[model samples]
Target chain A: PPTNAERLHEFHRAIGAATPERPTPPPPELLRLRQTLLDEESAEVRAEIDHLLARQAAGEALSAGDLAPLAHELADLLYVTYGALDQLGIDADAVFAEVHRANLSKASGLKPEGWRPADVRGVIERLQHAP
Target chain B: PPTNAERLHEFHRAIGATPERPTPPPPELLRLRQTLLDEESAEVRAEIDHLLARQAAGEALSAGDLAPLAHELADLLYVTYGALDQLGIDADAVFAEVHRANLSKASGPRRADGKQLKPEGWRPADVRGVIERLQHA
Candidate 1:
């Protein structure tokens, strides 16, 4: 029942804190590990979705149990995703807000007459700099 | 502020509704886009952070370090939008639902690491309900 933020905290503490000031794996290596973790979690999501589709294709009406795993996978995906942001010293919330603002400009259809893409270029640059 | 579902439905309907049957980007592409985006985003943040570390360590990170970064970041944004676009679902709404449920867990204090502590009575987010709503809506 932990929120995404809670999951992030646990992941950081477990992954970041476990090593303490040792810093043996180095941040770059740590980042790579996080990427691997994200991939692993995403694969689980794909696997879950594929399974659901298979059931649906066989004309099975999905029940609550069927979706529980999908939600779990997604939660973990978000968790590690936030962890990846945190590991990079990026402000996840700030980036989300920026992305949100950018997405708001998205046109209903494909790049229509004035469908400007989400300008997320400056998010990391801006968020990483503190006042 | 309109939630993510509103944004997703609008984008999905607009993109999926208006386009011809030129073979919609399959769920494979959707998932693949996310994975590709996953790598792109991870590298972007990692590269920037790495470059910063080098600079902080009394080294001048070359402008060359930035060229690939720009490419990756731009793709990250593009691929993310594409994934959502190809979803053809109200992902925005689902996101908000997940957010809404996530908010419910914030009945306690923070964990210094930004983990919002949950109250003993915390309830899990009913992501299934939102999925069903969006699926049937």
Candidate 2:
């Protein structure tokens, strides 16, 4: 029998191997439509914002009891997304970093104004208090 | 009461008793200035990028995958900025040449064109039909 980690990877690989084929080619006029749907359906975009909201309400002081479930959910999402990105020949790390940097960069308008960079603690505090 | 893992790190020291504080000369400010100096020197910030991107990607990739990623990233840096007097992109090809040269230099040089190239394979169109363009392209 496979180990727990191997079993999890196997599940992810199964999901990955099941990636669907693309729809029939659309007319040039409908190209934008295809792109829009693709953007909308991206796993990164199809997030459980509800979970994030719950975390926000719960605050930063998460015990292992709280974080363990979050990590499990995150791992599941990560594994699935990783498989998808791998199939697409994307660099997962680059995607993550760029997305995260965009969130923090002024271009995204998510970061605070004049927010002096701080350690992880500072980030947690901002996440708790800042809008 | 902390959990078992937390307690393990704190076996010798008391609970958060000795958080490392800055020194008397207001070391935090000086250290921040030093960090700033290092930050400005780097054109393509490598430190956190490697740790964050490499490590994050590794969490998903197999251990075998990590071996290639590590070596590929290292050589690209060397070829760039007149370091190794080689013509290849740090973010693109330097690492490939280095890895090839280091491992097996018997291969001929890979050709490159201005246009982007990609492998043909399965895409996530099943879940979302966006990735189908690569195949047509």
Candidate 3:
């Protein structure tokens, strides 16, 4: 037996609470927004990578400046990457599984009784060519 | 009285919704996101150091040597999901947007270097605008 004002309050709560229980984020805006966030992080990642590479080439010892921001941007990259995949209705897990296998295959001393590179492209071709 | 959903929708507009910039997420959520990302990121760095140390010591990089790397990668993914969850964002839906944009690259111009090139018909993703769209009912 909540008060009328409380009922209104609960109702008010629902709008801001538009999560998990239900959903709606329009296409044009979110689709575009998703891409934007992805690019923002991508640029940072690139910048960080370039700076690290440049320093390494300068005959300098590795610095703390090199690792932290790179990891931060990389984490953001994965976040947006998965977010984009979510919107597209792709199974991120499936793609990740294939990619993981591909990476694992790249490990040394465990291939063809000798040596070999990962087969990520092979998986891609196989997936795309499926009936 | 207005329809419940309609009132709810209208309330969204009344909130601090905007296309220009994102408002802060909950403080606690940010804290959690910050901690997880930091810890997980540090682990990845440590794993990388170990891997490189092995190389410096001239040890073979067998598949087993990569287990920690995989663990760190998995943690990154897990923490990323936690962040998306805190934002109440459907990571999958965002993926659709990026996927659509990426699909245009088939016939698009590209550089001899590794830079990603925009296609002739490409439209830039309006990320700021997207924030506004989703902010509404």
Give the residue spans of candidate 1 off by over 4 A: A1-26, A100-104, A112-116, B1-137
A-chain TM-score per prediction? 0.73, 0.33, 0.52
TM-score (chain B) for model 3?
0.61
- Candidate achieving higher DockQ, 1 or 2: 1
Looking at model 1 chain A, report the run of 10 residues with the lowest lDDT sum: A17-26
- lDDT tens readout by residue for model 3, A1-131: 33222222232233221111111222333334444555577567557556655666576665322344444454446645444334333333434454444434434223535444333334333433444
TM-score of 3: 0.41
**Local distance difference test, per candidate?**
0.50, 0.27, 0.43
Model 2: colliding residue pairs? A20-B126
TM-score of chain B of each: 0.55, 0.17, 0.61
lDDT of 2 by residue, A49-103 (tens): 2343355556644222322222222223323233333332333333333333332
Instruction: Give me candidate 2's TM-score against the actual structure.
Output: 0.22
Each candidate's iRMS in angstroms? 8.3, 21.7, 18.1
Question: How large is the interface RMSD of candidate 3?
Answer: 18.1
Give each prediction's root-mean-square deviation over alpha carbons: 8.6, 22.9, 19.5
Candidate order, TM-score descending? 1, 3, 2
Candidate 3 RMSD computed on C-alpha atoms after optimal superposition onto the true structure = 19.5
Task: Tell me, by TM-score, which candidate is best.
Answer: 1
Q: Specify the poorest-scoring 10-residue window by lDDT in model 3 chain A.
A: A17-26
Sort the candidates on lDDT, descending order: 1, 3, 2
